[PDB]
Amino acid sequence: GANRTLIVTTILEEPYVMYRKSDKPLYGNDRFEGYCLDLLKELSNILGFLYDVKLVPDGKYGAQNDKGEWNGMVKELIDHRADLAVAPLTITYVREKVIDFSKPFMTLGISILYRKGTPIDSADDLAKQTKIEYGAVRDGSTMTFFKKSKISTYEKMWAFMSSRQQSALVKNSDEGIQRVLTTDYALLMESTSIEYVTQRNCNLTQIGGLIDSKGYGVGTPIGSPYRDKITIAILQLQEEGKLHMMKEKWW
Amino acid sequence: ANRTLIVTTILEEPYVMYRKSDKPLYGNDRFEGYCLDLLKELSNILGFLYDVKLVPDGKYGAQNDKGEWNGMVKELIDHRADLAVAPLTITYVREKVIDFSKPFMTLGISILYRKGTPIDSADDLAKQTKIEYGAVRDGSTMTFFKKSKISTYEKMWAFMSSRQQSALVKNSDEGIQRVLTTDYALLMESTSIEYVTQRNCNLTQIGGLIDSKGYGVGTPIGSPYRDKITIAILQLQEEGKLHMMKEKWWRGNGCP
Ligand SMILES: N[C@@H](CCC(=O)O)C(=O)O
Numbered sequence: 001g002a003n004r005t006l007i008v009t010t011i012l013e014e015p016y017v018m019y020r021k022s023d024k025p026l027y028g029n030d031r032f033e034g035y036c037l038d039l040l041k042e043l044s045n046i047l048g049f050l051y052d053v054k055l056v057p058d059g060k061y062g063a064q065n066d067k068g069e070w071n072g073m074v075k076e077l078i079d080h081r082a083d084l085a086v087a088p089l090t091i092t093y094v095r096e097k098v099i100d101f102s103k104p105f106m107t108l109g110i111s112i113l114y115r116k117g118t119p120i121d122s123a124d125d126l127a128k129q130t131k132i133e134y135g136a137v138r139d140g141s142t143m144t145f146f147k148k149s150k151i152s153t154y155e156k157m158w159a160f161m162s163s164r165q166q167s168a169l170v171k172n173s174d175e176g177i178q179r180v181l182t183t184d185y186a187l188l189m190e191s192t193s194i195e196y197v198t199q200r201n202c203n204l205t206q207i208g209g210l211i212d213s214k215g216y217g218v219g220t221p222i223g224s225p226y227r228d229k230i231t232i233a234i235l236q237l238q239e240e241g242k243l244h245m246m247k248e249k250w251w
Numbered sequence: 252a253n254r255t256l257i258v259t260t261i262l263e264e265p266y267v268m269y270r271k272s273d274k275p276l277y278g279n280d281r282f283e284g285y286c287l288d289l290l291k292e293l294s295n296i297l298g299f300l301y302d303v304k305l306v307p308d309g310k311y312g313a314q315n316d317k318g319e320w321n322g323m324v325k326e327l328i329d330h331r332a333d334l335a336v337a338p339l340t341i342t343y344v345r346e347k348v349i350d351f352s353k354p355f356m357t358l359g360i361s362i363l364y365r366k367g368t369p370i371d372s373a374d375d376l377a378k379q380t381k382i383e384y385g386a387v388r389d390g391s392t393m394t395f396f397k398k399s400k401i402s403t404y405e406k407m408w409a410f411m412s413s414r415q416q417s418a419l420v421k422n423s424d425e426g427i428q429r430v431l432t433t434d435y436a437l438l439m440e441s442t443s444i445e446y447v448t449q450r451n452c453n454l455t456q457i458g459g460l461i462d463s464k465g466y467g468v469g470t471p472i473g474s475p476y477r478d479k480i481t482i483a484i485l486q487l488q489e490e491g492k493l494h495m496m497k498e499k500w501w502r503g504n505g506c507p
Pocket residue numbers: 061062088089090091136137139140141142143188189190
């Protein structure tokens with residue numbers, strides 16, 4: 001019979017996945033544009049699948065509690081409510097306990113999103129002072145990096161972000177960018193995103209360099225044939241310069 | 252007193268370069284660049300003096316048919332240097348034989364070529380004939396192509412290695428000159444491409460990155476400075492000092 005349509009879990013994040021503006025209503029995948037949708041169209045054609053894009057209901061990437069229970073897109077994959085997660089989702093060893101990733105299609109690191117023309121030049125500068133609040137998206141890999149760090153400065157930063165985490169952690173990056181613009185708040189954010197945001201907001205900058213180095217990959221349930229298949233299709237797109245043309249379009 | 256460490260390195264802009272002077276210079280004062288600043292910062296943290304020695308064959312390091320290494324990799328294996336502080340790519344094949352610190356910079360292989368052509372990818376170079384292409388002989392880019400099992404890259408390796416490897420170049424400066432003066436594209440690491448295209452505005456990076464790797468400080472297996480260098484790199488990172496060094500040596504006016 002015809003191929004079962006894949007369910008693709010994703011999350012709203014500029015410029016990876018965004019709502020298309022329209023006079024008329026938009027249904028299905030047509031609700032959506034961005035780097036990840038173009039990626040998905042390419043993967044969809046090289047491998048030949050139809051797909052349904054579903055936004056993760058809780059709107060989170062995925063972190064685990066102390067009982068080993070996950071949420072976000074990670075959970076959607078574990079529980080087979082999705083075949084693939086195609087989003088700016090960080091490949092990490094922790095998540096590899098429970099899901100698979102394709103090889104990476106983009107590389108990145110954690111850095112700071114803050115405002116231009118300040119004394120603040122680094123992580124040490126942020127941790128040491130008081131007036132500027134800082135944190136990360138709740139239940140994403142940046143928050144998890146700090147929560148697990150044994151590095152003395154980052155441990156202090158997690159204590160602060162964790163010492164009332166209701167003021168410091170943000171539900172999403174967009175919520176995150178507002179505090180930046182509005183309050184004295186510095187947002188711990190992935191460099192790919194920081195790049196995009198500052199080309200589009202001229203009061204905003206990256207601060208310091210990368211504090212780590214990671215990749216985004218396509219997520220699958222553990223053992224899925226689509227993992228190796230998507231690794232192969234991503235290599236093809238690298239060969240074709242097609243991922244590069246994708247990045248130039250959206251950034 | 253503490254033995255002065257021997258540091259193997261290689262000329263490569265802007266990591267390690269001869270400082271300009273009207274007199275000839277000696278010892279460490281000969282050199283400047285990102286890697287010399289990194290070394291100043293490492294030596295303070297760990298408490299050593301160092302002696303900078305350019306790798307005698309001017310190669311980074313690759314293994315021949317007989318399993319024999321050359322380059323800075325060989326200097327380390329043979330214990331002719333304590334440390335390699337250079338833009339030295341951390342690879343699985345080198346990790347079989349020397350150790351590395353955590354990376355201090357990340358990069359990926361890409362393509363340096365002239366601005367204004369239709370070439371936009373490795374596929375486009377690999378399919379055609381008119382434009383010659385290759386990499387620095389006995390460096391990790393050459394090795395990546397040499398060992399690739401990916402069809403496009405195997406073809407590219409067959410080509411750049413044909414006619415007695417005439418498409419390869421001895422060093423990056425020779426490759427950049429080759430790009431500038433003939434119809435030639437250089438397979439080069441992105442950090443280096445970024446430096447070069449700001450200073451040669453008729454050149455550009457083609458396609459994106461075709462792999463993802465790091466530079467790290469190389470030491471012999473077992474070295475009792477390896478983990479201490481990693482701890483220092485970590486400190487430099489949190490303090491923002493790596494980023495400040497990168498700005499010092501890369502940043503300037505974008506192309507008109
Ligand atoms: N890419 C991150 C989301 C954003 C962040 O945590 O900074 C993840 O997969 O969790």
